[PDB]
Amino acid sequence: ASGVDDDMACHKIPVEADFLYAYSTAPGYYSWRNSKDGSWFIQSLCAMLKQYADKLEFMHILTRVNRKVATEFESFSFDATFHAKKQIPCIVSMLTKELYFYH
Amino acid sequence: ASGVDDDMACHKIPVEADFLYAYSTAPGYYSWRNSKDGSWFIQSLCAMLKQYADKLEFMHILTRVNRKVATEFESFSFDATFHAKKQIPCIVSMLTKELYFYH
Amino acid sequence: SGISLDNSYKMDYPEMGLCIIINNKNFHKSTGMTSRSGTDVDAANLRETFRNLKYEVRNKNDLTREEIVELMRDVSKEDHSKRSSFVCVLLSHGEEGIIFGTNGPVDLKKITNFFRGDRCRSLTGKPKLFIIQACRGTELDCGIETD
Amino acid sequence: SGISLDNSYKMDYPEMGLCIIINNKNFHKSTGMTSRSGTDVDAANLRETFRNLKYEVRNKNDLTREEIVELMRDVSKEDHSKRSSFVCVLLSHGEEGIIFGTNGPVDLKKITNFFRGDRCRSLTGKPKLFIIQACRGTELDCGIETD
C-alpha cells in the first residue's frame, strides 16, 4: 500500500507529543485539599510513587492514585453545599512510550 | 492518624469515576482523516488492538497508538496552511483499575 | 482463598458489553458541514476489531443531534448487569467538547452524563470507554524533525 | 546485538531531570484569593518523593504570574541534554486551563508551550510531566454508594 500521508522521508513528531498532564481532578470540577494533611491528590500521588515507583509503569501508578483518591476520600463541610463530595483525578497522556522511573 | 475526609462508614465512588476518553487528537487541535484509508487515529487504534489486545493492558495499547499516529503520519495538502502537519492522540483516564480485554 | 489484589477490572462477566458506533458521514446541507469520506472504512474496521474482542457491536449511521441523545439515553437505560464494560465510538465533525449530529452539535458531557456512576447503576464500577474521532479545535501541529 | 523494541523511554541518562515545584500558598490581597493552608505539606512530600527518584528538585514559593512565566521560560532554556525527563508540579488556585500566580492567572498553555518539541530541543523525545493540583471549575461530585 502507498499514500500521501505516511512513510515521510524526513521523520518528524508532533510538537505536542511526549507530554503527560496528571490532573488532580476531572475537567470542570473543584479539587479538594485538607488544610492539615495536604491535598488528596498530592498525598495519594506521593504515597503511590513511594510504594510503586520501582515496580510499576507510570500510567499504572497513576491509575492506583485514581483509585486511592476515588475510594478513600470524601469531603466534610459545615456547609451542606460542599459536604460529602468526591473526587477523581484525571490522567491526560500524550506520551508515546511506557515510562519507568527505574532501569 | 484520623481526619474528617477519609475512612467513610458508607463507601462511595465519584460519579465521574471509571471513564476513559480516547481522543484522536490533543485539546484544541484538528483531527486528520484520509479520505480513502480512514482516520489516522481509528486506523492505528484498530491495528494496535488487533495486535496487542490479548497481550497488553489498555493504557499501554493506547500508548502504542499514540506513537504510531505521532511517528507514521503527516498530512499532505495542496493548501500550504494544512500541509505537512502532525497529530498526537490524547488519552484521558479517570479509570481506577487496569483493563485487560482478556482474562 | 489466597491473597486477592483487585488491581484490574473484572472482565469475565457473561458479556464483554456493548460497542456503540455512531458513524456520521453525511450532514444536512443546512449545517454547511462537509461529508466525511473514509469514515465508513473506520466504522467497518471498528466493527470487526471489537467483534473479535467479543463486544456486541451496534452501528448507527448519520444520526441527528436528537437521535444521538435518544440513542445514548436508551442504551444507558438497558440492564448492563451481565456486561463487563461499555464502549462508545463517535465518528464525526467536532470542536472542543462537542460532537456533531447531522443537524447540529451535541455536548459530549450530555452524552457521557447518561453513564455517570449514579445514573447507570448497572455500569457503576465498570469501565466506560468513549473513543472520539473528531476535531477539538482549529490548531495545527507543525511537528519537529527528530534526531 | 539482539532484537530492540524501544517501547519505553530511555531513563538512564546521567540525570533523571528537574522537578520544579511551584508552591503558591499566599496570594495578594488585591486578588481576593484565600491562602492555601496545607500546601506546604504537599510541597515537602513532593520534594522528598522526587528526591528519592533522583530528580533535581527545585522549589519556589508564592510566585506572581510574571515570575511563573519567567521561571518556566528560563528552565526551558537550560540544556537538558543529559537529563532523561522533565517534571513540573503546580500547586495553587485554578480554573479550567488556568493556574493562578499570586497576583493573577496564567494560562497552562503558556507554561507548557515553552517545552514544546520544537521549542525545547534538549527535551524533544523525552517525557515532560506536569502535575497539577488546582480547581478545573466549580462542579462538585456527589458520588454514588458502591455495592
UniProtKB/Swiss-Prot annotation, chains C, D:
Effect of D147A: In P3-D3A mutant; abolished cleavage and activation, leading to prevent thiol protease activity
UniProt-recorded name of the protein: Caspase-3 subunit p17
Active site: H93, C135
Modified positions (S-nitrosocysteine) in chain numbering: C135
Domain of life of the native organism: Eukaryota
